[PDB]
Short mmCIF file of C-alpha atoms in Angstrom, two decimals:
data_model
loop_
_atom_site.label_atom_id
_atom_site.label_comp_id
_atom_site.label_asym_id
_atom_site.label_seq_id
_atom_site.Cartn_x
_atom_site.Cartn_y
_atom_site.Cartn_z
CA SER A 1 0.11 0.20 -0.07
CA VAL A 2 0.86 4.03 -0.96
CA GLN A 3 1.13 7.29 1.87
CA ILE A 4 1.96 9.88 0.50
CA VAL A 5 1.50 13.51 2.50
CA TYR A 6 1.39 16.61 1.15
CA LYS A 7 2.01 19.48 3.33
CA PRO A 8 4.53 22.27 2.56
CA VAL A 9 3.64 25.28 5.29
CA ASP A 10 4.39 28.73 3.62
CA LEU A 11 4.64 31.51 6.88
CA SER A 12 6.66 33.80 4.08
CA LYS A 13 6.88 37.75 3.97
CA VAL A 14 7.28 39.71 0.59
CA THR A 15 8.05 43.79 1.82
CA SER A 16 8.88 46.01 -0.25
CA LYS A 17 8.80 49.81 2.11
CA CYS A 18 9.87 52.35 -1.16
CA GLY A 19 9.76 56.12 -1.49
CA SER A 20 10.28 58.80 2.09
CA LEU A 21 9.26 56.75 4.75
CA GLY A 22 9.21 58.17 8.87
CA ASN A 23 11.30 60.96 8.13
CA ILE A 24 10.81 64.02 10.81
CA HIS A 25 11.82 67.73 8.62
CA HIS A 26 11.37 69.63 12.20
CA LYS A 27 11.15 73.46 11.23
CA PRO A 28 12.55 73.49 7.22
CA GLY A 29 12.72 77.33 6.32
CA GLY A 30 12.78 77.91 2.44
CA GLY A 31 14.80 80.80 0.61
CA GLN A 32 13.63 83.90 -0.68
CA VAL A 33 13.90 83.30 -4.64
CA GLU A 34 13.41 85.71 -7.12
CA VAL A 35 13.21 84.84 -10.50
CA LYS A 36 13.87 88.17 -13.36
CA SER A 37 13.88 87.28 -16.89
CA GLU A 38 13.30 89.97 -19.37
CA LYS A 39 13.37 89.23 -23.77
CA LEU A 40 13.72 85.83 -23.49
CA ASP A 41 12.91 83.32 -26.59
CA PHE A 42 12.10 79.77 -27.11
CA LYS A 43 12.07 77.98 -29.61
CA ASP A 44 10.44 74.27 -28.08
CA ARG A 45 9.26 72.83 -25.56
CA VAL A 46 9.68 75.20 -21.72
CA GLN A 47 8.63 72.78 -18.82
CA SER A 48 9.87 75.10 -15.32
CA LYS A 49 9.32 74.97 -11.28
CA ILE A 50 10.38 77.66 -9.35
CA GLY A 51 9.13 77.67 -6.31
CA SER A 52 10.93 77.39 -1.96
CA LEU A 53 10.99 73.97 0.09
CA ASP A 54 9.18 72.07 -3.23
CA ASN A 55 9.76 68.20 -1.19
CA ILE A 56 9.33 65.98 -3.73
CA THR A 57 8.28 62.14 -3.29
CA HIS A 58 8.35 59.63 -7.67
CA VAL A 59 7.74 55.68 -6.58
CA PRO A 60 7.87 54.27 -10.40
CA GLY A 61 9.11 50.40 -8.45
CA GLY A 62 8.21 48.89 -5.67
CA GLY A 63 6.14 46.93 -7.11
CA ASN A 64 6.65 42.95 -5.42
CA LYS A 65 6.33 39.66 -7.58
CA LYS A 66 5.72 35.87 -5.61
CA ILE A 67 5.08 32.44 -8.41
CA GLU A 68 4.77 29.61 -6.09
CA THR A 69 3.57 26.24 -8.47
CA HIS A 70 2.74 22.36 -6.60
CA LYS A 71 2.52 19.53 -8.69
CA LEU A 72 2.15 16.79 -7.32
CA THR A 73 1.82 13.47 -9.71
CA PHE A 74 1.39 9.42 -9.16
CA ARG A 75 1.69 7.29 -11.82
CA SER B 1 -4.64 0.74 -1.22
CA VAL B 2 -3.16 4.53 -1.68
CA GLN B 3 -3.94 7.19 0.33
CA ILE B 4 -2.66 11.20 -1.08
CA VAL B 5 -3.80 13.56 1.51
CA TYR B 6 -2.78 17.06 -0.24
CA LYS B 7 -2.71 19.60 2.09
CA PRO B 8 -0.47 22.78 1.66
CA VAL B 9 -0.92 25.56 3.71
CA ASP B 10 -0.18 29.12 2.70
CA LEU B 11 -0.37 32.13 5.24
CA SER B 12 1.61 34.39 3.73
CA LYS B 13 2.23 38.06 3.22
CA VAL B 14 2.73 40.53 -0.05
CA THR B 15 2.74 43.61 1.04
CA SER B 16 4.02 47.04 -0.92
CA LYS B 17 4.28 50.73 1.39
CA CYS B 18 5.64 53.38 -2.38
CA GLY B 19 5.58 57.09 -1.39
CA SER B 20 5.12 59.51 1.04
CA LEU B 21 4.86 56.85 4.80
CA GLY B 22 4.79 58.53 8.80
CA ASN B 23 6.67 61.56 8.24
CA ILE B 24 6.41 64.64 10.22
CA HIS B 25 6.46 67.59 8.34
CA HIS B 26 6.94 70.55 11.55
CA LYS B 27 5.90 74.33 10.79
CA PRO B 28 8.07 73.99 7.65
CA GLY B 29 7.53 77.32 5.94
CA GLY B 30 7.89 78.18 2.36
CA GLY B 31 9.55 81.65 1.18
CA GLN B 32 8.60 84.57 -0.63
CA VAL B 33 8.88 83.38 -4.30
CA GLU B 34 8.45 85.88 -6.92
CA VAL B 35 8.37 86.02 -10.87
CA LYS B 36 8.90 89.47 -13.10
CA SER B 37 8.74 88.23 -16.73
CA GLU B 38 8.85 91.46 -19.77
CA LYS B 39 8.56 90.57 -23.52
CA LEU B 40 9.06 87.11 -23.31
CA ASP B 41 7.35 85.37 -26.27
CA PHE B 42 6.85 81.19 -27.08
CA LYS B 43 7.19 79.09 -29.77
CA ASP B 44 5.69 75.82 -28.34
CA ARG B 45 4.32 74.19 -25.05
CA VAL B 46 4.79 76.07 -22.33
CA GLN B 47 4.40 74.09 -18.37
CA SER B 48 4.61 76.71 -15.74
CA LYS B 49 4.04 75.82 -11.55
CA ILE B 50 4.89 78.89 -9.65
CA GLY B 51 4.86 78.03 -6.00
CA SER B 52 6.44 78.03 -2.51
CA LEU B 53 6.23 75.01 0.42
CA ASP B 54 5.01 72.51 -2.55
CA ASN B 55 4.56 68.83 -1.68
CA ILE B 56 4.43 65.85 -4.16
CA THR B 57 3.41 62.52 -3.81
CA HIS B 58 3.34 60.32 -7.42
CA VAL B 59 3.45 56.40 -6.68
CA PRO B 60 2.97 54.63 -10.91
CA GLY B 61 4.70 51.61 -9.05
CA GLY B 62 3.43 49.94 -5.93
CA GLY B 63 1.43 46.80 -7.44
CA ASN B 64 1.48 43.33 -6.25
CA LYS B 65 1.08 39.87 -8.17
CA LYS B 66 0.78 36.95 -6.91
CA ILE B 67 0.64 33.85 -8.85
CA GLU B 68 -1.12 30.26 -6.85
CA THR B 69 -0.90 27.37 -9.43
CA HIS B 70 -2.36 23.62 -7.52
CA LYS B 71 -1.82 20.62 -8.95
CA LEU B 72 -2.75 17.01 -8.94
CA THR B 73 -2.79 14.15 -10.31
CA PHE B 74 -3.63 9.90 -10.50
CA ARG B 75 -2.91 7.92 -12.88
CA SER C 1 -9.09 1.42 -2.99
CA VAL C 2 -7.96 4.54 -3.59
CA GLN C 3 -8.80 7.30 -1.15
CA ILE C 4 -8.10 11.44 -2.69
CA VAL C 5 -8.15 14.02 0.39
CA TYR C 6 -7.04 17.74 -1.56
CA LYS C 7 -7.70 19.55 1.42
CA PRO C 8 -5.22 23.59 0.29
CA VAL C 9 -5.50 26.14 2.32
CA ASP C 10 -5.17 29.43 1.89
CA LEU C 11 -4.64 32.34 4.93
CA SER C 12 -2.42 34.51 2.98
CA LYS C 13 -2.67 38.26 2.21
CA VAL C 14 -2.18 40.95 -0.87
CA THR C 15 -1.78 44.43 0.41
CA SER C 16 -0.48 47.83 -1.67
CA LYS C 17 -0.42 51.13 0.64
CA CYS C 18 0.41 53.59 -2.07
CA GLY C 19 0.06 57.40 -1.73
CA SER C 20 0.12 59.32 1.43
CA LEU C 21 -0.73 57.51 4.27
CA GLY C 22 -0.59 58.50 7.99
CA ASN C 23 1.56 61.80 7.84
CA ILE C 24 1.65 64.62 9.93
CA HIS C 25 1.49 67.93 8.59
CA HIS C 26 2.01 70.69 12.22
CA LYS C 27 1.03 73.79 10.72
CA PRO C 28 2.42 74.57 7.65
CA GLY C 29 3.80 78.02 6.32
CA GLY C 30 3.62 78.65 1.75
CA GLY C 31 5.19 81.50 1.19
CA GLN C 32 3.62 84.86 -0.22
CA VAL C 33 3.60 84.21 -4.10
CA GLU C 34 3.92 87.58 -6.63
CA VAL C 35 3.80 86.44 -10.63
CA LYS C 36 3.62 89.48 -12.18
CA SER C 37 3.90 89.82 -16.41
CA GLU C 38 4.16 91.61 -18.69
CA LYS C 39 3.74 91.85 -23.33
CA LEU C 40 4.15 87.61 -22.58
CA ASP C 41 3.30 86.20 -26.80
CA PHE C 42 2.46 81.79 -26.98
CA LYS C 43 2.00 80.32 -30.06
CA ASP C 44 0.86 76.93 -28.45
CA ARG C 45 -0.98 74.66 -25.41
CA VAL C 46 -0.17 76.33 -22.09
CA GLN C 47 -0.40 74.38 -18.85
CA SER C 48 0.13 77.04 -15.93
CA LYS C 49 -0.54 76.62 -11.80
CA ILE C 50 0.45 78.94 -9.45
CA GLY C 51 -0.54 78.67 -5.45
CA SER C 52 1.56 78.29 -2.71
CA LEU C 53 0.65 74.88 0.00
CA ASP C 54 0.15 73.55 -2.77
CA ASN C 55 -0.56 69.02 -1.01
CA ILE C 56 -0.62 66.61 -3.94
CA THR C 57 -0.64 63.32 -3.98
CA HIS C 58 -1.07 61.08 -7.17
CA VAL C 59 -1.23 57.23 -7.61
CA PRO C 60 -0.87 55.69 -11.10
CA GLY C 61 0.00 52.27 -9.29
CA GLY C 62 -0.93 50.46 -5.83
CA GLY C 63 -2.75 47.52 -8.00
CA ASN C 64 -3.15 44.64 -6.92
CA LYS C 65 -3.33 40.70 -8.86
CA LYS C 66 -3.45 37.63 -7.78
CA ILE C 67 -4.40 34.49 -9.70
CA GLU C 68 -5.22 31.67 -7.89
CA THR C 69 -5.60 27.76 -10.42
CA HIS C 70 -6.81 24.38 -8.54
CA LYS C 71 -6.77 21.55 -10.15
CA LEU C 72 -7.17 18.19 -9.84
CA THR C 73 -7.50 14.72 -12.50
CA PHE C 74 -8.24 11.60 -11.70
CA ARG C 75 -7.70 8.30 -14.38
CA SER D 1 -6.07 64.19 -111.01
CA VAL D 2 -4.21 66.74 -107.25
CA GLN D 3 -6.15 65.98 -104.20
CA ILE D 4 -4.62 68.16 -101.07
CA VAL D 5 -5.18 66.64 -97.99
CA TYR D 6 -4.27 69.32 -94.52
CA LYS D 7 -5.11 67.39 -91.17
CA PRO D 8 -2.24 69.53 -89.37
CA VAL D 9 -3.78 67.98 -85.57
CA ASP D 10 -2.94 69.65 -82.75
CA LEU D 11 -2.98 67.83 -78.19
CA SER D 12 0.11 70.05 -77.29
CA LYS D 13 -0.21 71.36 -73.59
CA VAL D 14 0.83 75.39 -72.94
CA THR D 15 0.94 75.72 -68.72
CA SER D 16 2.51 78.16 -65.77
CA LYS D 17 2.60 77.42 -62.19
CA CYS D 18 3.99 80.45 -60.93
CA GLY D 19 3.73 82.12 -57.57
CA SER D 20 3.20 78.79 -54.50
CA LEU D 21 1.81 76.23 -55.10
CA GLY D 22 0.87 73.97 -52.63
CA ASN D 23 2.56 75.02 -49.49
CA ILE D 24 2.82 73.10 -46.73
CA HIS D 25 2.93 75.71 -43.50
CA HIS D 26 2.30 73.30 -41.09
CA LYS D 27 2.47 75.87 -36.97
CA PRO D 28 4.39 79.45 -38.79
CA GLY D 29 5.09 81.61 -35.82
CA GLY D 30 6.15 85.08 -36.64
CA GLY D 31 7.83 85.67 -32.76
CA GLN D 32 6.13 88.93 -30.98
CA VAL D 33 7.55 92.66 -33.32
CA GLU D 34 8.31 96.29 -31.26
CA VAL D 35 9.20 99.30 -33.60
CA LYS D 36 9.61 102.37 -30.61
CA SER D 37 10.28 106.19 -33.50
CA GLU D 38 11.77 109.52 -31.49
CA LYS D 39 12.37 112.52 -33.63
CA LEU D 40 12.60 111.07 -37.02
CA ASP D 41 13.57 113.29 -39.75
CA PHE D 42 11.48 113.15 -43.37
CA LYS D 43 11.72 115.25 -46.95
CA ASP D 44 10.36 112.41 -49.35
CA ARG D 45 8.17 109.10 -49.43
CA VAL D 46 8.21 106.59 -46.88
CA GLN D 47 7.53 103.40 -47.47
CA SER D 48 7.27 101.54 -43.81
CA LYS D 49 5.56 97.42 -43.91
CA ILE D 50 5.90 95.91 -39.88
CA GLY D 51 4.20 92.05 -38.67
CA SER D 52 5.30 89.24 -37.71
CA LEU D 53 4.30 87.04 -39.76
CA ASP D 54 4.26 88.40 -43.80
CA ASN D 55 3.11 85.19 -46.13
CA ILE D 56 3.68 87.48 -49.76
CA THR D 57 3.39 86.26 -53.26
CA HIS D 58 3.52 88.49 -56.76
CA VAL D 59 3.56 87.41 -60.45
CA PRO D 60 4.19 90.51 -61.82
CA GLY D 61 4.75 86.84 -64.82
CA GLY D 62 3.47 83.00 -65.75
CA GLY D 63 2.20 84.92 -68.83
CA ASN D 64 1.65 82.42 -71.95
CA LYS D 65 1.44 83.30 -75.43
CA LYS D 66 0.18 80.37 -78.00
CA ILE D 67 0.84 82.20 -81.93
CA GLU D 68 -0.69 79.64 -84.31
CA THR D 69 -0.43 79.82 -88.16
CA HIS D 70 -1.86 77.98 -90.86
CA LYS D 71 -2.06 78.59 -94.70
CA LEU D 72 -2.18 76.87 -97.78
CA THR D 73 -2.17 77.80 -101.13
CA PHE D 74 -2.83 76.15 -104.18
CA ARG D 75 -1.19 78.20 -107.93
CA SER E 1 -1.41 62.74 -110.07
CA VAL E 2 -0.84 64.45 -107.35
CA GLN E 3 -1.02 63.44 -104.05
CA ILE E 4 -0.10 65.59 -100.26
CA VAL E 5 -1.03 64.50 -97.05
CA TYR E 6 0.41 67.06 -94.65
CA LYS E 7 -0.71 64.98 -91.03
CA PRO E 8 2.11 66.64 -88.24
CA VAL E 9 1.47 66.00 -84.93
CA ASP E 10 1.90 68.02 -82.37
CA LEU E 11 1.38 66.92 -78.80
CA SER E 12 4.21 68.74 -77.24
CA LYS E 13 3.95 69.72 -73.47
CA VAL E 14 6.12 73.36 -72.69
CA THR E 15 5.25 73.92 -68.82
CA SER E 16 7.50 76.22 -65.98
CA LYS E 17 7.12 75.26 -62.87
CA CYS E 18 8.57 79.10 -60.30
CA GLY E 19 8.61 79.99 -56.90
CA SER E 20 7.71 78.20 -53.87
CA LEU E 21 6.47 74.42 -55.39
CA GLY E 22 5.23 71.62 -52.69
CA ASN E 23 7.08 72.55 -49.61
CA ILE E 24 6.83 71.58 -46.58
CA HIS E 25 7.87 74.38 -43.77
CA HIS E 26 7.39 72.09 -40.54
CA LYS E 27 6.89 74.55 -37.45
CA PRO E 28 9.54 77.64 -38.89
CA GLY E 29 9.75 79.85 -35.57
CA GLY E 30 10.60 83.73 -36.41
CA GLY E 31 12.47 85.38 -33.21
CA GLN E 32 11.44 88.00 -31.10
CA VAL E 33 11.95 91.32 -32.80
CA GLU E 34 12.70 94.84 -31.63
CA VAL E 35 13.85 97.97 -33.54
CA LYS E 36 14.76 101.71 -31.67
CA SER E 37 15.46 104.92 -33.69
CA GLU E 38 16.31 108.69 -32.44
CA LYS E 39 17.30 111.98 -33.91
CA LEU E 40 17.77 110.17 -38.19
CA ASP E 41 17.75 112.55 -40.64
CA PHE E 42 15.98 111.06 -44.06
CA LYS E 43 16.39 113.50 -47.26
CA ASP E 44 15.16 111.59 -49.97
CA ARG E 45 12.41 107.79 -50.21
CA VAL E 46 13.01 105.22 -47.36
CA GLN E 47 12.04 102.29 -47.55
CA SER E 48 11.45 99.91 -44.86
CA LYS E 49 10.30 96.44 -44.10
CA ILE E 50 10.54 95.41 -40.15
CA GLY E 51 8.77 91.38 -39.00
CA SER E 52 10.52 87.69 -37.57
CA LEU E 53 8.71 85.57 -40.43
CA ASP E 54 8.51 86.38 -44.28
CA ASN E 55 7.35 84.30 -46.61
CA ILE E 56 7.85 86.40 -50.35
CA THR E 57 7.89 84.59 -53.89
CA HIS E 58 8.53 86.63 -56.68
CA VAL E 59 8.46 85.86 -59.92
CA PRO E 60 8.69 87.69 -62.68
CA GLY E 61 9.67 85.40 -64.92
CA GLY E 62 7.97 82.14 -66.18
CA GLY E 63 6.56 82.96 -68.84
CA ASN E 64 6.00 80.73 -72.33
CA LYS E 65 5.93 80.95 -75.81
CA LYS E 66 4.89 78.69 -78.06
CA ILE E 67 4.91 79.97 -81.78
CA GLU E 68 3.98 77.31 -83.95
CA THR E 69 4.07 78.54 -88.61
CA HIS E 70 2.96 75.54 -90.77
CA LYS E 71 2.86 76.78 -95.09
CA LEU E 72 1.39 74.11 -97.81
CA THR E 73 2.37 75.72 -100.45
CA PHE E 74 1.40 73.74 -104.22
CA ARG E 75 3.05 75.56 -107.45
CA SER F 1 2.57 60.20 -109.96
CA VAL F 2 3.60 62.00 -107.05
CA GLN F 3 2.57 61.09 -103.73
CA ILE F 4 3.53 63.63 -100.21
CA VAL F 5 3.17 61.70 -97.35
CA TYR F 6 4.33 64.96 -94.15
CA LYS F 7 3.71 63.04 -90.76
CA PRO F 8 6.32 64.68 -88.66
CA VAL F 9 5.63 63.57 -84.71
CA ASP F 10 5.92 66.02 -81.90
CA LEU F 11 5.92 64.35 -78.18
CA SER F 12 8.65 66.69 -76.44
CA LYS F 13 8.66 67.96 -73.06
CA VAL F 14 10.40 71.76 -72.33
CA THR F 15 9.78 71.78 -68.45
CA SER F 16 10.79 74.21 -65.76
CA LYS F 17 12.26 74.68 -62.46
CA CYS F 18 13.00 77.32 -61.24
CA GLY F 19 12.64 78.56 -57.74
CA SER F 20 12.61 76.48 -54.58
CA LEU F 21 10.74 72.94 -54.90
CA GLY F 22 9.94 69.94 -52.62
CA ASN F 23 12.32 71.79 -49.84
CA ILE F 24 11.79 70.19 -46.30
CA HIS F 25 12.24 73.13 -43.17
CA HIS F 26 11.46 71.04 -40.55
CA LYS F 27 11.50 73.94 -37.57
CA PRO F 28 14.41 77.10 -38.97
CA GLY F 29 13.88 78.93 -36.04
CA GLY F 30 15.15 82.39 -36.63
CA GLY F 31 17.21 83.88 -34.22
CA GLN F 32 16.01 86.82 -31.49
CA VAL F 33 16.54 90.52 -33.61
CA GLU F 34 17.78 93.83 -31.92
CA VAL F 35 18.59 97.20 -34.33
CA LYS F 36 19.71 100.33 -32.03
CA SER F 37 19.45 103.86 -33.76
CA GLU F 38 20.98 107.00 -32.64
CA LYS F 39 21.24 110.31 -35.20
CA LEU F 40 22.20 108.90 -38.01
CA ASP F 41 22.41 111.07 -41.17
CA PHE F 42 21.51 110.19 -44.78
CA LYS F 43 21.17 112.16 -47.67
CA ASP F 44 19.51 109.74 -50.72
CA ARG F 45 17.57 106.33 -50.96
CA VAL F 46 17.96 104.20 -48.31
CA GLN F 47 16.08 100.55 -48.42
CA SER F 48 15.75 98.37 -44.74
CA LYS F 49 14.34 94.80 -43.91
CA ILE F 50 14.70 94.15 -40.69
CA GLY F 51 12.99 90.35 -39.61
CA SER F 52 14.69 86.74 -38.31
CA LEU F 53 13.52 83.97 -40.23
CA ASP F 54 13.18 85.48 -43.90
CA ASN F 55 12.40 82.81 -46.00
CA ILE F 56 13.04 84.42 -49.82
CA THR F 57 12.07 83.03 -53.76
CA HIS F 58 12.89 85.94 -56.54
CA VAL F 59 12.45 84.34 -59.74
CA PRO F 60 12.60 86.50 -63.08
CA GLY F 61 13.95 84.23 -65.48
CA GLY F 62 13.24 79.74 -65.85
CA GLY F 63 10.95 81.43 -69.11
CA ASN F 64 10.37 78.76 -71.68
CA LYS F 65 10.05 79.89 -76.04
CA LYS F 66 9.84 77.43 -78.88
CA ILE F 67 9.72 78.71 -82.73
CA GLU F 68 8.82 75.79 -84.26
CA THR F 69 7.96 75.20 -88.45
CA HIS F 70 5.99 73.53 -90.86
CA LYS F 71 7.01 74.47 -93.97
CA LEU F 72 6.26 72.09 -97.55
CA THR F 73 6.78 73.37 -101.41
CA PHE F 74 5.78 71.52 -104.41
CA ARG F 75 7.32 72.40 -107.57
#
């Protein structure tokens, strides 16, 4: 006679922690900002940010992938 | 006789934490901003952001994918 | 005789936390903003944002996907 | 006997394509213009054109002339 | 007997293509212009053009002249 | 007897292509221009052109001339 017991057990973690996590920003101070522009001429696309204390987080990553195959064949 | 017990157990975790999490911004102070523009000429698309204490979080990622296949074949 | 017990158990978790979560912004101060424009000329699309203390969260991601296939074949 | 068959055949084409024909001006951007004049002294005819985007077609020519003669003389 | 069969045939093409034909001006950007004039003195004809983008086609030529004499003299 | 068959056949093409034909001007950007004049004294005809991107096609020529004669004389 044949007895087969198939009991794989998984308690695993797959985890990603991406970007800005758990930071403290105590009294951050942006300076005075002045932009004075005269007689400029642009022939193509202009992309402009003018600011002070600009705080930015960008996260295209951090994606988790788990693939798990279980197979049993008898005869 | 043939006895087959198929009892795989999954208690696993797949997790993503993406962008800005648990951060503390105590009294952030954006500075004064001045933009003076004269006689400018633009011949294509202009994208402009003028600000002060501009806080931005962008997350195209963080997507989790889990695939799980279970198979049993007898004779 | 043949006895087949197919009792796979899933208690797993798939979770995404994307964007801005649990952050604290205590008394944020946007600075004064001044935009002065004279004789400007634009010949294509203009996209302009003028502000102060601009808080923005954008999440195109964070999507979870779970695929689970169970198969049993006898003779 | 005398037989004269005068059957000249004309299928000729005389064609002129003068000036601007079939041109494509996709999004032409004539820049900004400023003209400032002070204490100017003139004593004869003044001809002045001021603009930003001038498309001009002048065609004193392109004329077609077709002179033809068919003289048949008998004795 | 005398037999004359005068059957000259003309399928000729005379063509002129003069000036600007079939050109593609994709996004031509004439830059910004400024003209500042003070205390100038003139004593004969003044001819002036001020612009940024000009597209000028001038065609005094391109004319066509076909001259054709058919003559048959019998005795 | 006398038989005269006069069958000259003309399929000639006379073609002129003068000036600018089939050119592609992809994104030509004329630079910015400034003209400053003070106390100038003129005493004869003044001709002035000011611009940033001037496309000029001038065609006094390109004209076609086709002179032809078909003379048949019998006795």
